[PDB]
Amino acid sequence: SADWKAIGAYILGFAIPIILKALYMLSTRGRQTVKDNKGTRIRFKDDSSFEEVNGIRKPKHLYVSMPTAQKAEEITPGRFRTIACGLFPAQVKARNIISPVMGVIGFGFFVKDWMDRIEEFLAAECPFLPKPKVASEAFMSTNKMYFLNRQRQVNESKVQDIIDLIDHAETESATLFTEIATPHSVWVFACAPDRCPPTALYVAGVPELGAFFSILQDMRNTIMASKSVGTAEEKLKKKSAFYQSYLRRTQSMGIQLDQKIIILYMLSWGKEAVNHFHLGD
């Protein structure tokens, strides 16, 4: 599907404020800016985005295509959100841009002390590494060790287009990361990308983090559904499949998710995450 290399190169040529401006709009006010838009493309502008040509400043506009309906280069709002939440998560955090879709499963509170959480999680013993016995190999039986194993494993599943994208972004204004225990790794999902962002696909345990959030979404949906006025069917018929969606789309990028990591996230963090769902009112 999408040519993430080409799309990213285009987006990486703009000033950070206009990119984030459009990322804010399409994440929060998504369906309405499309409905309200006169014609063929969505045009974005911002005083940070210009070209000096030469005695005169010419504004430089960010275009995202209208998404009706049916190829590789085109920057739909979905592709734009997916790409940009991966390229600029430090800036997303700095501006505190959180999609309502993520806001209602309590993303804001969840990430509040992210570094402490992810370090606690990685320093914990991993139930899929047998077995400490001798408490001096203890460094070999931690989740962190499991993630090192995983990192070397996914390294085998890399596609060139995304390798190219990552390499290009590092020389630009992207705020990429290579490890999960960084302040900004979790912020690639703040705008509710419909799949793991391209540039994050090969950081161990990060695409599984997206899956974790997607399951919380389904969990919230299940909880909201039980207490809502429901043709007894139309309750089951307009259910949600966020996880199956995220799963299908992320794995279509040429990686298989580590289900065991997904299980460790859900069982480590699930209980307290549910306590921060917006239900609903």
UniProtKB/Swiss-Prot annotation:
GO cellular component assignments: host cell Golgi apparatus; host cell perinuclear region of cytoplasm; ribonucleoprotein complex; viral nucleocapsid
Modified residues (Phosphoserine): S268
Ranges where the record places region Interaction with host UBE2I/UBC9: 71-73
Compartments reported by the entry: Virion; Host cytoplasm, Host perinuclear region; Host Golgi apparatus, Host cis-Golgi network
Location of the motif YxxL: 63-66
EC numbers on record: 3.1.-.-
Key words of the record: Chaperone, Coiled coil, Endonuclease, Host cytoplasm, Host Golgi apparatus, Host-virus interaction, Hydrolase, Inhibition of host innate immune response by virus, Inhibition of host RLR pathway by virus, Nuclease, Phosphoprotein, Ribonucleoprotein, RNA-binding, Viral immunoevasion, Viral nucleoprotein, Virion
GO biological process: symbiont-mediated suppression of host innate immune response
Impact when changing S268H: Complete loss of inhibition of MDA5-directed ISRE or IFN transcriptional responses
Main localization category: virion
Location of region: Involved in the inhibition of IFN induction: 134-178
GO molecular function: endonuclease activity; RNA binding
Record-stated family: Belongs to the hantavirus nucleocapsid protein family.
Self-association state and partner proteins as the record states: Homotrimer. Homomultimer. Homomultimerizes and binds to viral genomic RNA to form the nucleocapsid. Interacts with host MAP1LC3B; this interaction participates to the protection of Gn from virus-triggered autophagy. Interacts with host SNAP29; this interaction participates to the protection of glycoprotein N from virus-triggered autophagy. Interacts (via N-terminus) with host RPS19; this interaction probably mediates the loading of the 40S ribosomal subunit on viral capped mRNA during N-mediated translation initiation. Interacts with the viral RdRp. Interacts with host SUMO1 (via N-terminus).
Annotated domain remarks: The N-terminus is required for chaperone activity and, in trimeric form, this region likely serves in high affinity vRNA panhandle recognition. The N-terminus also contains a coiled coil region, which probably participates in but is insufficient to initiate N trimerization. The YxxL motif is indispensable for the interaction with host MAP1LC3B. The central region is involved in specific RNA-binding. Has distinct cap- and RNA-binding sites so it can bind simultaneously both the vRNA and mRNA cap.
Function: Encapsidates the genome protecting it from nucleases. The encapsidated genomic RNA is termed the nucleocapsid (NC) and serves as template for transcription and replication. The nucleocapsid has a left-handed helical structure. As a trimer, specifically binds and acts as a chaperone to unwind the panhandle structure formed by the viral RNA (vRNA) termini. Involved in the transcription and replication initiation of vRNA by mediating primer annealing. Plays a role in cap snatching by sequestering capped RNAs in P bodies for use by the viral RdRp during transcription initiation.
Protein name stated in the entry: Nucleoprotein
Gene name for this UniProt entry: N
